Amino acid sequence: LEKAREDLAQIQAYIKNLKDVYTKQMEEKNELEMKAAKTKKKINTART
Amino acid sequence: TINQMEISLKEEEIQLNEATEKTNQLLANLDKESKKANQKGEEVAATN
């Protein structure tokens, strides 16, 4: 029972690693989103 | 200026698409791993 519980777990540890990578990922992607905003309207107004 | 804001929008949009692809595929892999983890945890709870 203990051995099977430990084997099934490993998955949780890998999930936590992936979740931390995800953490840095959506922080950086939100920064890139706010940068990529404010220039679309700029190109539209520029070409108007 | 038009060329400048166009270039910034282009590079930031392609970087956004790359990061969003990264965010998406990780979620699918994590969902598969979570399904396997829950099924194996139910099996472990049974076995214990």
Contact A7 B40 (CB under 8 A): yes
Q: Which chain A residues are Cβ-neighbours of B32 within 8 angstroms?
A: none
d(CA B21, CA A21): 14
Supply B38's token pair.
Answer: 């829950």
The sign of the torsion formed by the CA atoms of A40, A45, B2, B4 equals negative
d(CA A30, CA A39): 15
Beta-carbon contacts below 8 Å between A and B: 75
Give buried/exposed letters for A8-43 (b at 16+ CB in 10 A, else e).
Answer: beebeeebeebeeebeebeeebeebeeebeebeebb
The resolution of the experimental structure, rounded to one decimal in Å, is 38.0
- PDB experimental method: cryo-EM
Any chain A CB within 8 A of the CB of B18?
no
Phi-psi region of A37 (alpha: psi -120 to 50; beta: other; left: phi over 0): beta
Instruction: Identify which of B20, B38, B19, B42 has the alpha carbon closest to the alpha carbon of residue B30.
Output: B38
Supply B8's token pair.
Answer: 């910034």
Any chain A CB within 8 A of the CB of B17?
no
d(CA B44, CA A6): 9
